[PDB]
Design a protein around this ligand. Structure first.
Ligand SMILES: [Zn+2]
Ligand SMILES: [Zn+2]
Length: 59
């Protein structure tokens, strides 16, 4: 397992998915910029790090 940074619990094989590079629950897609927790992989991905599509388009 590898630990989910948003919710604080360890993600085993629950809602475990890779977005950019890091393990994520599909509720817990925490943004590197603004920190808004997002849905599945629908947003913008950078190298091993995620950023919202809306917040990164603004920034
Ligand atoms: Zn989580
Ligand atoms: Zn964001």
């Amino acid at each position: 397992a590898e630990k989910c940074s948003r919710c604080g619990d360890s993600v085993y094989a629950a809602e475990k998915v890779i977005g950019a590079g890091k393990p994520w629950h599909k509720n817990c897609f925490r943004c590197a910029k603004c920190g808004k927790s997002l849905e599945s992989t629908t947003l913008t991905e950078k190298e091993g790090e995620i950023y919202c599509k809306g917040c990164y388009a603004k920034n």
